Amino acid sequence: MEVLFEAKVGDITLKLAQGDITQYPAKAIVNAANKRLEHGGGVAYAIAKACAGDAGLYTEISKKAMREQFGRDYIDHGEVVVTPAMNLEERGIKYVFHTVGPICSGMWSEELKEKLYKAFLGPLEKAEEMGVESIAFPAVSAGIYGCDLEKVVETFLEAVKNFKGSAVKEVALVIYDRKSAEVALKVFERSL
Ligand SMILES: Nc1ncnc2c1ncn2[C@@H]1O[C@H](COP(=O)(O)OP(=O)(O)O)[C@@H](O)[C@H]1O
Ligand SMILES: [Mg+2]
Numbered sequence: 240m241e242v243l244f245e246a247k248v249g250d251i252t253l254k255l256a257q258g259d260i261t262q263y264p265a266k267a268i269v270n271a272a273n274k275r276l277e278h279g280g281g282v283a284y285a286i287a288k289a290c291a292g293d294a295g296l297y298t299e300i301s302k303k304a305m306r307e308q309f310g311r312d313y314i315d316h317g318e319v320v321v322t323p324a325m326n327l328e329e330r331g332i333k334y335v336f337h338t339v340g341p342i343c344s345g346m347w348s349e350e351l352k353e354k355l356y357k358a359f360l361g362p363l364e365k366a367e368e369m370g371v372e373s374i375a376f377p378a379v380s381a382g383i384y385g386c387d388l389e390k391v392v393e394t395f396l397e398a399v400k401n402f403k404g405s406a407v408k409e410v411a412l413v414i415y416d417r418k419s420a421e422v423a424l425k426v427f428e429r430s431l
Contacts, residue, residue, distance in 0.1 A: 240256055240257075240258035240259070240262055240263065241256060241257045241258060242254055242255070242256045243255045243256060243257055243420060243423075243424050243427075244424060244427045244428070246427070246431045248399055248400055248410075248431075249400070249402075250405075250408070251399070251402075251407060251408060251409065251410055252408065252409050252410070253399060253410050253411070253412075254409070254410070254411040254412070255411070255412050255414070255420075255423055255424060255427050256411055256412070256413050256414070257413075257414050257415075257416075257417060257420040258413060258414075258415070259285065259413075259415070260282060260285075260286070260375055260376075260377050260413040260415075261285055261286055261289040261290075261327060261332070262330065263332070263375040263411060263413050264330075264331055264373070265331075265332060265373040265374055265375035265409070265411060266331065266332065266333050266334070266371045266372060266373045266374065267332070267333065267334045267335070267336050267362075267366055267369075267371045267373065267374045267375070268286065268324070268327075268332055268334075268335055268336070268374070268375045268376075268377075269335075269336045269337075269338055269362045269374065269375065269376040269377060269379070270282060270283050270286045270287075270335050270336065270337045270338065270377070271283065271338065271339075271340055271358075271377045271378070271379040271380065271382070271384075272301075272320075272337045272338065272339055273339060274313045274314060274315070274339050275302075275312065275313055276298065276301040276302055276305050276314070276320060276337055277298050277302075278294050278297060278298045278301065279294070279298075280383065281382045281383055282377040282382070282415070286335060287301075289326060289327055290322075290323075290324050290325045290326050290327050290335060291325055291326065292326060297322070297325075300322055301320060301322050301337060304320050304321065304322045305320040305337075308320055308321070314337070314339055315339070316338075316339055316340065316341060316354040316355075316357045316358050316361075317338075317354075317357030317358065317360070317361045318338075318339075318361060319336050319337060319338050319361045319362050319365040320336075320337040321334055321335070321336060321337070321365065321369075322334070322335050322337065323335070333371075334369075334371065336361075336362040336365055336366070336374070338358045338359070338361050338362050338379065339358060340354065340355050340358040340359075340379035340380030340384060340386065341354035341355055341358070341380055341384065341386065342380070342384045342385070343380060343384055343385050343386035343387070344384070344385045345385050345387075347386070347387060347390055351386065352390070352394060355379060355380055355386060355390075355391065355394045356394050356397060356398055358379050358380070359376065359379060359394060359395050359398035359399075360398040360401070360402060362374060362376065363398065363399070363402045363404065363407060363410070364402070364404070366404075366406070366407050367402075367404035367405070367406050367407050369406075370406045371406065371407070372406055372407060372408045372409060373407075373408065373409040373410075373411075374407060374409070374410055374411070375410075375411040375412075375413050376395060376410070376411065376412050376413065377413060377415075378391050378392070378395075378412070378414055378415075378419065378423070379391065379395070381419070388419055388422050388423065389422060389425075389426055392412065392422075392423045392426040392427070393426060393430065395412055396426070396427070396430050
């Protein structure tokens with residue numbers, strides 16, 4: 240796990256790091272899940288596997304929590320389903336905030352952007368609402384959902400800046416591959 244950047248955003252300490260989010264020193268980690276919380280691949284799989292030891296198991300636990308927290312088998316952009324980090328609790332990660340970003344498929348518009356923004360802000364406010372002081376995010380929609388990485392990071396930062404809370408003291412963006420990390424770093428530098 241390598242921290243590539245660290246700046247102050249309001250009263251929050253924002254960090255950019257390269258590595259596996261399931262190993263980040265945060266109380267809550269965000270999962271870039273699909274509307275059904277079916278963790279079949281991407282970071283969702285990694286997180287599901289690291290929490291329950293078996294992705295299929297966490298997929299079921301997530302569906303239950305969602306049904307319990309919303310009354311349906313799906314969530315909308317902005318809505319966050321909370322589930323215990325289980326096996327990750329011994330690392331300091333207590334919860335997993337499940338959020339759903341848009342499916343860009345290589346496109347970009349104000350509509351897609353607004354959905355990704357909600358997908359990023361939702362977890363922050365959920366962290367505020369719960370009193371969690373530290374939270375780490377993955378590059379929501381930058382993988383399978385094909386949203387431009389640079390656009391993703393810009394949107395993530397816009398959310399972090401517009402966010403208004405007192406409990407959240409630390410926020411991080413964790414990027415898996417080095418190539419993408421450098422791209423994210425450039426955005427962080429020119430935005431701050
Ligand atoms: N273990 C992991 N930790 C942090 N980021 C990860 C991990 N595995 C994948 N990622 C990154 O998370 C981003 C989200 O992609 P993906 O998981 O398919 O979800 P989405 O459907 O939102 O695109 C990608 O940029 C991917 O490289
Ligand atoms: Mg959509």
